[PDB]
Design a protein around this nucleic acid. Structure first.
Ligand SMILES: [Zn+2]
Length: 667
RNA sequence: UCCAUGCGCAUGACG
RNA sequence: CGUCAUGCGCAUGGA
């Protein structure tokens, strides 16, 4: 409930109008200052006795929880109403009531936006920006094209212009709230010049309709006292491959596949995908099946260039073991093909000796063990530990690996995000909290993490941040995590990877240059530029809405037939399908049901083809074992258009399918 | 607390 | 515009 001196001056303009931005580094505790702005605004509104609301917005739920528990309540526990609002907190009360109540709100973004849309539709109780007297944001540097919450500012922008027009038109003018923006260093997006960066910043500011940035320069001394920045550091340090590449070449010869590129990169992957579409556009075999296999192989390569090939053997053991299980489940109610037999036998004839090759070291892994061991010695104990990388699979893999070799012990644990993707077992927010807490105790010495740890997770006191094969903001936040107590950054990758840390330093210089330029600017010219950017953004939104509205026009019941994509085989019609939840599609009418096969290895079985292809899940809804499917695995056959099409999702086409009627299923 | 799914978004790399 | 990897949020349904 007190102001630092450097916080004082920067907060100063916001206290009277001054919709502004703030950027300060980690550790400066910009929540306290924000709270002071809140309390001062509220006290002002009590002095005028008017509606004082704050609608604080974030990108993630965790920060809302943190600030509710620890920042907003303990300083406004006494006076005012507070509530921490999230998509996950099943809350009995609805949003516009906690607008009707709850002078202070902490919230995640799209709650608000959804409520505004319910307004614009008029569906459920609505809300508008007129119910407010202030807005505060965290992480404004996400404010850009089609951001989660940036859309709302465009409405604030749209109505704003109306106000000015109304002042010209009739001159009644509705109020609009003050806007505060907080962030770390905003960074910069896709620049090589100061002008590009400056245009970015002006874009941000007029997307926030701000007035200035108001960074700290006077009281830099106490800041640098609180803020100790660690040392910018760079620390940099067979036949199985060809054994497999020969197989790949044999497979091209088997398939007449001309790569027009090398093995072990994205271009070969993309060519494989395009060929797989075309052979899906042709309904042939040995042409798309092998595109998929070769996709798997190139994945195996690009891990082999970075990972112990034992993990590639794991990958392919998983794959082909599933393949054998698929073909056996097909045979259970039935035989192979020359294609499948060729590929499988080509694999299995080598599989054992290839696993033998896997057990032969002759690699960045050695450099990694060296980099790990050296820090354990210098610390001699009580060494915190962080690792970054790209993927999820890498983390499980390396954790399993490090469990096996040495350890002197630093028990380390993996970490990933949450998303339902990658064909992996994700983690859970609870589990993330558990892990970071154990690290907070230091019981877990080393963390293996993707780019979650850099983002917004409370970590500190650490020293040995690294990079095994990985923008300026990620860099500065990872530097913020490791403190200036014998802490050293490390980067390890085959080698422009140094280029990127260098670029981050370069952008760190450039952003300060642009900040200094814009701050020292005419208020007139500044306002003119920001108005132009606001008009540009608004017209851009109108064009996007025009294109989207013009997009979907057909909305047909049944114009198609869905087919197997390995075998150009009829599977379903357009009218035989039905819908549940207005989300999922399904095919009853057991004429269909005579076709498929079912499998389940470990809560819902999976539906697979007579060719062997995997098509869906035994979705159990309302007591019906609804065989749901995924359009990703299916191909389109219009009666009208000969060309085949494939979408990866239902909403690509506009043509609608009906909602299911269980009264049909009256037995 | 766990699980399945849909939708939207940003970021990095690649064409 | 297309691909991949990563991350985020929201909405459903179930235990
Ligand atoms: Zn089939």
């Amino acid at each position: 409930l007190q102001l630092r001196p450097y916080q004082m001056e920067v907060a100063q303009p916001a206290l009277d109008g001054k919709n502004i931005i703030i950027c300060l580094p980690t550790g400066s505790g910009k929540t306290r200052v924000a709270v002071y702005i809140t309390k001062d605004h509220l006290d002002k509104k009590k002095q005028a006795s008017e509606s004082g609301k704050v609608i604080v917005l974030v990108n993630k739920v965790m920060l809302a929880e943190q600030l509710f528990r620890k920042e907003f309540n303990p300083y406004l526990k006494k006076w005012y109403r507070i509530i921490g609002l999230s998509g996950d907190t099943q809350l009995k009360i609805s949003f516009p009531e906690v607008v009707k109540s709850y002078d202070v709100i902490i919230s995640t973004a799209q709650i608000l936006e959804n409520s505004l849309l319910n307004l614009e539709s008029g569906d459920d109780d609505g809300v508008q920006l007129s119910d407010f007297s202030l807005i505060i944001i965290d992480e404004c540097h996400h404010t850009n094209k089609e951001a989660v919450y940036n859309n709302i500012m465009r409405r604030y922008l749209k109505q704003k212009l109306r106000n000015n027009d109304l002042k010209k038109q009739n001159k009644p003018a509705i109020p609009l709230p003050q806007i505060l923006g907080l962030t770390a260093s905003p960074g910069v997006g896709a620049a090589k010049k100061q002008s590009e960066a400056e245009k970015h910043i002006l874009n941000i500011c007029a997307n926030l309709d701000a007035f200035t940035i108001k960074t700290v320069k006077e009281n830099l001394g106490q800041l640098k006292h609180q803020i100790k920045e660690p040392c910018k550091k760079f620390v940099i340090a067979n036949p199985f491959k060809e054994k497999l590449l020969e197989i790949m070449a044999s497979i091209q010869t088997y398939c007449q596949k001309s790569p027009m590129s090398d093995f072990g990169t994205q271009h070969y992957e993309q060519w494989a995908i395009q060929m797989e579409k075309k052979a899906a556009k042709d309904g042939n075999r040995k042409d798309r099946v092998c595109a998929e296999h070769l996709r798997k192989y190139n994945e195996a390569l690009q891990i082999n260039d970075t990972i112990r090939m034992i993990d590639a053997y794991s990958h392919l053991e998983t794959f082909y073991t599933d393949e054998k299980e698929k073909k056996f489940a097909v045979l259970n109610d039935s035989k192979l093909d020359e294609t499948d037999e060729f590929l499988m036998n080509l694999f299995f004839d080598n599989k054992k000796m290839l696993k033998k090759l896997a057990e032969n070291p002759k690699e960045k892994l050695i450099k990694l063990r060296n980099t790990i061991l050296e820090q354990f010695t210098r610390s001699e104990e009580s060494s915190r530990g962080i690792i970054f990388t790209k993927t999820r699979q890498s983390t499980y893999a390396l954790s399993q690996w490090i469990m096996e070799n040495a350890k002197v012990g630093v028990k380390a644990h993996h970490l990933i995000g949450a998303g339902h993707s990658s064909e992996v077992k994700p983690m859970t927010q609870t589990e993330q909290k558990e892990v970071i807490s154990k690290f907070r105790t230091g019981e877990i010495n080393l963390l293996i993490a993707t780019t979650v740890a850099e983002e917004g997770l409370d970590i500190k006191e650490c020293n040995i941040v690294i990079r095994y094969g990985l923008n300026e903001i990620a860099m500065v936040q990872a530097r913020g995590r490791a403190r200036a107590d014998e802490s050293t950054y490390v980067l390890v990758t085959s080698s422009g990877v140094t280029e990127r840390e260098i670029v981050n330093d370069f952008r760190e210089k450039m952003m300060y240059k642009a900040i200094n330029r814009v701050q020292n600017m005419k208020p007139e010219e500044y306002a003119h530029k920001i108005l132009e950017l606001q008009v540009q953004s608004i017209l851009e939104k109108k064009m996007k809405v025009k294109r989207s509205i013009a997009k979907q026009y057909n909305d047909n019941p049944s114009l198609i037939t869905l087919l197997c994509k390995n075998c150009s085989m009829l599977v379903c019609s357009g009218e035989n399908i039905h819908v549940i939840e207005k989300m999922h599609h399904v095919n009853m009418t057991p004429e269909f049901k005579g076709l498929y096969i079912v499998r389940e290895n470990k809560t819902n079985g999976e539906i697979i083809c007579k060719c062997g292809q995997a098509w869906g899940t035994m979705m159990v809804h309302k007591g019906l074992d609804l065989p749901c499917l995924k359009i990703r695995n299916f191909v389109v056959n219009f009666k009208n258009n000969s060309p085949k099409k494939q979408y990866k999702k239902w909403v690509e086409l506009p043509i609608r399918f009906p909602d299911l009627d269980y009264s049909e299923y009256c037995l």
